[PDB]
Amino acid sequence: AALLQCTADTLADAVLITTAHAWQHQGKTLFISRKTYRIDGSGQMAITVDVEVASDTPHPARIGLNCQLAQVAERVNWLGLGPQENYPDRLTAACFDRWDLPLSDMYTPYVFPSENGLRCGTRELNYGPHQWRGDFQFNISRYSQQQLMETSHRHLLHAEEGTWLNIDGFHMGIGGDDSWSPSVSAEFQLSAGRYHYQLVWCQK
Amino acid sequence: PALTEAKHQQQFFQFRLSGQTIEVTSEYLFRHSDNELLHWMVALDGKPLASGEVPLDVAPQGKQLIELPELPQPESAGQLWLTVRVVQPNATAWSEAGHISAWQQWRLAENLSVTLPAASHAIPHLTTSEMDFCIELGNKRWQFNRQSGFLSQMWIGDKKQLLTPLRDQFTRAPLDNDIGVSEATRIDPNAWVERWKAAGHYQAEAALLQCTADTLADAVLITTAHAWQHQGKTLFISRKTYRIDGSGQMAITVDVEVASDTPHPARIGLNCQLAQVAERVNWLGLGPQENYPDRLTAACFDRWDLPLSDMYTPYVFPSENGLRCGTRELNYGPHQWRGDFQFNISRYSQQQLMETSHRHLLHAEEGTWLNIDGFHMGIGGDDSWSPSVSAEFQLSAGRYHYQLVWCQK
């Protein structure tokens, strides 16, 4: 990521920050992301993200923003499809209700570790002090995405301090009919080339 | 307008493209392509860097592989477009020479531009009244009405740009398919028009949920929230923010929330009436035939120029018509529109179109009605009698976002 542009401005009731980032590989830009942060008098924070994906580039597996949080919580409470991990390609099993689970549960053990435990169509996500409001797909786990890709086996992974949190406006479909060849459906892939999602960061 | 769509789908030749290489498959059972000419033009942003023409020699059921000279690469931001069409060098008894049997369009690898608009020395100055919100930059003046919650007037000179305040429109004149067999004497529950009419979708009246005025150092930003309520039930909530550049180019971002219960809005768009009248409409998008999301296959993406009369499509029975889709930029007269949207520009108001029994009856309203839609519902339909619209085409998302830029000149 590089900063294409950045700015700071003050609303009478709130402060608004706008950041533009371009992701470039080999002189070619895979994605352009524009984010504006607006701060309420209440102090609740609203994030609006606009993502542009080049038509040429293979479609991004997911579009989301990921942060690492020092705080660790016993239980994760969210309102959305639950309680089993669900994906857009296979979200049929899940149903929408308030959900409470042990934090360990969110992670799904696999012999081979790949991104897992994703939850979809969640209006609000609650972990510890933080409250998240909006429509998004969130996976919350100790292990970093980079860590998950690296490890040969599930047993090997050691949880990083704090909890990694991922929030995705859109997630690519898991698939697949066939392991050998891509089994993902055409509709599921995020080929739109234009993407918009917004969420709110709220204390308590 | 539909007939062109039939021609494109019907055409015997099938084109599959991998990388530089283009492969053509012949529909024909019995005939070799004795006199077929294949022409390919590559253009960027409505401009073609190169044109390639190859003679075609495919036996019936035959597959012919054609490889382009390596395409020019443009540093400039934009999307490369490759268009291949087949024309007959010698006219058949039915067709004059230079007639085109088939065409195909493929996007080239996309280009994303990280170049930045900023910065412009001029800064917008806004003057506030209880009655109205006024923004002035240079000669141009922008007026927003607090009571209304929409900006009534756009100012040039020494001139007034628009007769009618810009507003969100969730309805389009009913298509033949939507109306179906439904009649005032014998209304049918199933028909799309009936669902909308029962909904109060047409009669819903906007209210200002909230409004505000703020000044950026380089720009002035206005935020309006509107709730459309019928019978104590809110069909849609729309939030719009207008940001004014130092350049004075204006950017609109619209967020629309639709209740899950309500029948899906036929279109989500904002429609305004403009006093100015222009001889020709120039836009970059699918062209030149009117196209809809359900049937946008016929249309191809290139810079398009047409007489203003052309945009309207004559119908014995008048329903919303002449819509254009996937248009990056729309140009009418002084105004420039930048973004991705579906636009129909016509003299007749949508309200007028729905009202009239016959096409002949309509009389053009002064100025030109302009409609811009972030998303448009699919026309359909397999059957007139029952809704033929596909499930995917309908805008059931319940969340919608689109943004466009209003630019002078």
The share of residues in helices of chain A is under 10%
Inertia-based shape of chain A = globular
In angstroms, what is the radius of gyration of chain A?
Answer: 18 Å
From the helix content, strand content and strand pairing of chain A, which structural class follows? mainly beta
CATH domain class of chain A: Mainly Beta
User: What is the CATH third-level topology name of chain A?
Assistant: Beta-galactosidase, Chain A, domain 5
Percent in strands of chain A: over 45%
Task: Count up the helices of chain A.
Answer: 2
Question: Would you count the extended β strands of chain A for me?
Answer: 11
Structural domain tally of chain A: 1
Following the backbone from N to C, one meets helices and strands of chain A in this order, namely: EEEEEEEHEEHEE
Separation, N- and C-terminal Cα atoms of chain A: 31 Å
Biggest sheet features of chain A? 11 strands, antiparallel
Oligomer: part of a larger assembly
What's the architecture of chain A in CATH terms?
A: Distorted Sandwich
Name the biggest interface: A-B, 23 and 19 residues
Family (chain B): Belongs to the glycosyl hydrolase 2 family.
GO biological process, one term (chain B): lactose catabolic process
Protein name (chain B): Beta-galactosidase
Site (Important for ensuring that an appropriate proportion of lactose is converted to allolactose) (chain B): 385
